[PDB]
RNA sequence: UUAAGUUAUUAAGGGCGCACGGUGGAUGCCUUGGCACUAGAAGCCGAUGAAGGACGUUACUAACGACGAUAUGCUUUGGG
């Protein structure tokens, strides 16, 4: 997802993004050490996803300010 | 045939010459790195936590670079 959705989203809604991106991220993370995880480029995708979503909320409280 | 006399061949190995190899890394050519300077700029950094480090970050990760739990990178403005 990308930085122009992101700003679309609602800080609620971040916030909740960055807790289904990182549970996502997990079982990514689970699965690659079991060796059920073929497409292993998703978790870099998702990776950098949180770190956007980090980043716009940064961005946020740091405008608020 | 006998007698007297003379002189070779031998190369176990060695010497000189030559041919062909090996080792070794001189020499020539080369340069990715140095050395000495010129001109212009600049001449500090740190409790808003420095210099320098440790430990980590990649799909697989021992090491160097980069980066810092937003980690082998994030946003934005311009270039291409
Ligand atoms: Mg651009």
């Given at each position: 997802m990308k930085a122009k959705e992101i700003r679309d989203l609602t800080t609620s809604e971040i916030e909740e993004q960055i807790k289904?991106?990182?549970?996502?991220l997990f079982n990514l993370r689970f699965q690659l050490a079991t060796?059920?995880?073929?497409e292993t480029a998703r978790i870099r995708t998702v990776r950098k996803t949180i770190a956007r979503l980090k980043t716009v909320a940064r961005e946020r409280?740091?405008?608020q300010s």
């Amino acid at each position: 997802m990308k930085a122009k959705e992101i700003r679309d989203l609602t800080t609620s809604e971040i916030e909740e993004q960055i807790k289904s991106s990182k549970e996502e991220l997990f079982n990514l993370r689970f699965q690659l050490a079991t060796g059920q995880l073929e497409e292993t480029a998703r978790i870099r995708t998702v990776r950098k996803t949180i770190a956007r979503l980090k980043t716009v909320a940064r961005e946020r409280e740091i405008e608020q300010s």
